[PDB]
Design a protein around this ligand. Structure first.
Ligand code: CFQ
Ligand code: CFQ
Ligand code: CFQ
Ligand code: CFQ
Ligand code: NAG
Ligand code: NAG
Ligand code: NAG
Ligand code: NAG
Ligand code: CL
Lengths: 532, 528
């Protein structure tokens, strides 16, 4: 049977699912690690021990314990990102979509959801992997990993809560894929890991980490890169936060042993409820428990590894969306509302840049402000809104990614950069938010191909070319089909620095994506701040 | 006679001079102070001792000892600024242009030449005051003052070379006008001091200095203000340079009096020959001997005086020209040439910014560069040129003056700001240089009216209105006679363009770049 598979660990029974007037195979909730529960909470994940009999893999598994967004209850625009299954610590599972009839040894794509390393689920409606698998005939894998404290509590020196275990869960799902994807018609030698936001950062951390390097061939990073300011902390910062987490729950703080034993006695939701209390400053686009530069999963600073070319050499495809910042300003900055134009006064702009660049001293904030203010028209609420938007998106996403692409390229074997700037005709968020962080995803997953979701014809077409670029990149390492008559996404090179827009207009090639502002964020500000 | 005048210090005989198919009286080289020579070198000026008989004021006096420019021998665009008379240390004279028939108690305008405090003359063809006096019926005065070491050698604490004597010379010329201009038909209660560059700066120093306030009514500042980076130094920096001059002429440096007596024994040119060697940085738009914040001519810091409103409260009219920096890049920056578009490479740009902002550290230089560079097209030679042309102009002239204008307006009684962006049709300098530092002057003095100088008909008209604004301001404190030039206010910050096209009103003159230069960069440099 097409739906029964003999994996290394045990047998698996999938389910046939309809997809655009056809069908394909799905294997949902397949375990790839022993449940990280009880005294195992905060520990490195252990391989799932073999099982006898058939594993029912016909339904999505649990989502990991995480903070649920309740800003807009019942609003589809936000809840579309919330867990849609029972949360549980027993959440280490992956999902596979296999074309029917089963392919021989085809391209694999592994999806690593984002969500600031504090949230995310593999089961969301926007991650339904059937359309992409079916349309591009690839084997699509959806993995999961512990988020928040559960996946990132870092008490360096301790083997009970070493940190980076959520990144280690990802690696184990990858190893799983490497050991078994062949039984599903996938080529373990041609696996592309791709992810958005903390998912794009994860992908890049696997490109850097020596222990993850050989578990994949190529990589795709969307709206996130490993060196993002919010994607990692030092061992000290990691330890301070874990200690503060304990102080927040009246834990014994004599030793890591006692602190850790204490935390393992708290119910999940108890940790979640104080999770945000450990951050250094009041801010936006900052998350509590994230990867740590431990000298193990990450041998040295991300920067030195990047400067010395100490990373996996291969082809990467990555890009950003036009308004990566709006989502965050809406949730945590004064002046912004989802029920208005959110025109920002000069006062709100000032408090806004402070909430956005939390680590900056006075001189630093002055420089940012100077950088994003039109002093001829400084009371213009629209300019102030768009100004703060760009601040948040340039600082947290775009410039850190450009820094990364520019470094990676000196050593890599092929880079393709994109700027997604298409505002969906059916977006549920207000107009001022633009092409929001996370909204190219529905195009990558081909949701526009399901007529009942009301996308325009041209949107279906955009979705089809994006999936084709992705899959084609995945199979070959170049998004372009050889000897094709269509316009060509050119190679990004350190000398030319070319990239394309991704929208419904005919492709356009541009150069030096946001250089001005990125020269500021990547070179100048860092210096100004170092000078102190 | 109309040409014979009894002054307080003595009798003076002027001379009749033609002007636009007509005539007016001219009184040239009237002495307003004892020649500051010999033992008097570097000292405060002493009032001119009265004389018996009649003083021959029919020809221009000597120009003060100064570094003559030889960058372009023969070339008129540069030589028009060099001394056109013999240089001497006996150079403290002033010139008066009086309309004929002699007016009664009329408006006076006193001109103060510039040239970074190291040069300048009262006799240049472009300062001939006959056109302005005749056309507007004002008594026009051009005074002079010691420049370079002779006017600003500063060994604070000594009476042999206290510093600021050149500013004290200007002040004495003002006292003279105050005590005598009435005898020439001028109203001492309606004296306007105006000047450009070091001259525009001087004007502001007299607005600041308590000792100079009651000697004039109003002020006009052209492309210069007191707080310009190049217009002053501290008592220590002043002393450091004075000592370094001695070290350069192998002088005994045991004490101030000894160092001084030694500098007095040198021939004028010997001092001039080592003048630039005392600058601490390798740069442009920087001059060796300049005013010193001594606590006497200037009570406190220029800024504290500005913040506390400690200065003369009156009306002021000032402005800048579009391309202040070009003159300076041409002379001292690589890449620039009088005979080419002077397109600048990225490398000549980096060095050019280091030459323009000599005090800033690396972080500072980065902020400057970041600010004036278009990174999507960083190898554009024209943007690099125009870009460097703005740095030097914004830093040295435009932003220091906008800072001044905004501090002054908080306490003042009326501000009028202009932006001069017309390029003379007959300019001898290359197009890339634009509207150069000092070229509004020919318009303020109405040279466009003398037909043989070949200015367009519309340039004569631009000159005519500029002169009328100046004189009308001088006379009433408002350049408008009952299209208006609106008042500048801290809320609106309005100013006008001064060109051939119909007047246009703008707001917030170069606010973007000046927020950088006046607020951000200073802070950056202090912190780091
Ligand atoms: C494809 As998503 C990385 C789950 C887009 C939204 O997620 C952001 C976010 C940003 C600003 C406000 C709220 C949220 N949110 O609720 O998820 C965050 F934080 F997860 F990264
Ligand atoms: C006690 As809280 C007001 C959930 C700490 C941070 O809150 C952020 C936030 C809240 C929810 C998802 C993402 C973010 N963020 O990325 O900053 C914001 F925006 F509300 F301040
Ligand atoms: C009305 As003027 C203030 C005597 C014209 C420019 O003079 C500048 C200058 C700037 C750059 C190069 C050369 C010179 N120059 O020979 O005078 C300086 F220095 F006098 F102010
Ligand atoms: C030994 As030299 C080459 C007379 C030091 C300064 O020289 C300036 C300069 C020379 C003549 C008039 C004005 C300036 N200036 O304002 O900087 C420049 F430009 F030549 F370097
Ligand atoms: C027999 C078996 O174990 N397979 C079941 C399948 O029949 C059921 O539809 C699904 C939903 O609960 O769970 C699995
Ligand atoms: C764009 C790029 O760098 N591609 C290179 C290619 O030129 C080279 O032939 C190949 C083999 O080493 O490695 C890869
Ligand atoms: C009348 C008189 O004594 N004034 C003299 C004038 O005669 C002489 O020609 C001029 C020379 O420059 O100097 C003055
Ligand atoms: C522009 C300005 O400041 N004008 C003022 C005027 O309003 C005031 O009446 C006068 C006398 O006090 O002083 C001056
Ligand atoms: Cl003495």
């Amino acid at each position: 049977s097409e739906l029964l598979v003999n994996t290394k660990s045990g047998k698996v029974m999938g389910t046939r699912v309809p997809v655009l007037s056809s069908h394909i195979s799905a294997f949902l909730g397949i375990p790839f690690a022993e449940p990280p529960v009880g005294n195992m909470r905060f520990r490195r994940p252990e391989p799932k021990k073999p099982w006898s009999g058939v594993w029912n893999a016909s339904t999505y598994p649990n989502n990991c314990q995480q903070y649920v967004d309740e800003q807009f209850p019942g609003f589809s625009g936000s809840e579309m990102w919330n867990p849609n299954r029972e949360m549980s610590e027993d959440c280490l599972y992956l999902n596979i979509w296999v074309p029917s009839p089963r392919p021989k040894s085809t391209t694999v794509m592994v999806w690593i959801y984002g969500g600031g390393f504090y949230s995310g689920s593999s089961t969301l409606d926007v991650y339904n992997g059937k359309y992409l698998a079916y349309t591009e005939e690839v084997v699509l894998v959806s993995l999961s990993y512990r988020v928040g404290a559960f996946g990132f509590l870092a008490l360096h020196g301790s083997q009970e809560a070493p940190g980076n275990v959520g990144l280690l869960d990802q690696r184990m799902a990858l190893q799983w894929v490497h050991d078994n994807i062949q039984f599903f018609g996938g080529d373990p030698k041609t696996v592309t890991i791709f992810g958005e936001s903390a998912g794009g950062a994860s992908v890049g951390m696997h490109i850097l980490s020596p222990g993850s390097r050989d578990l994949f061939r190529r990589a795709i990073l969307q709206s996130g890169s490993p060196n993002c300011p919010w994607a990692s902390v030092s061992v000290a910062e990691g330890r301070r936060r874990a200690v503060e987490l304990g102080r927040n729950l009246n834990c014994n703080l004599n030793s890591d042993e006692e602190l850790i034993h204490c935390l393992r006695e708290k119910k999940p939701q108890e940790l979640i409820d104080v999770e945000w209390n450990v951050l250094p400053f009041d801010s936006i686009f900052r998350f509590s428990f994230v990867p740590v530069i431990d000298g193990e999963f990450f041998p040295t600073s991300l920067e030195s590894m990047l400067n010395s070319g100490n990373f996996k050499k291969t082809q990467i495809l990555l890009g950003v969306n036009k308004d990566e910042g709006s989502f965050f300003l809406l949730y945590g900055a004064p002046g912004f509302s989802k029920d208005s134009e959110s025109k920002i006064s000069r006062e709100d702009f000032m408090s806004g840049v402070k909430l956005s660049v939390p680590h900056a001293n006075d001189l630093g904030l002055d420089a940012v402000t100077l950088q994003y203010t039109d002093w001829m028209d400084d009371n213009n609420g629209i300019k102030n809104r768009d100004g703060l938007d760009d601040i948040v998106g340039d600082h947290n996403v775009i410039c850190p990614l450009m820094h990364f692409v520019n470094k990676y390229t000196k050593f890599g074997n092929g880079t393709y950069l994109y700027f997604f700037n298409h505002r969906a005709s059916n977006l549920v968020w207000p107009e001022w938010m633009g092409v929001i962080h996370g909204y190219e995803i529905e195009f990558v997953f081909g949701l526009p191909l399901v007529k009942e979701l009301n996308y325009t014809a041209e949107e279906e077409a955009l979705s089809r070319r994006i999936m084709h670029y992705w899959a084609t990149f995945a199979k070959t390492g170049n998004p372009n089909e050889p000897h094709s008559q269509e316009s060509k996404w050119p190679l990004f090179t350190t000398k030319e620095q070319k990239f394309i827009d991704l929208n419904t207009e005919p492709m356009k090639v541009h150069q030096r994506l946001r250089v001005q502002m990125c020269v500021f964020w990547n070179q100048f500000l860092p210096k100004l701040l170092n000078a102190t």
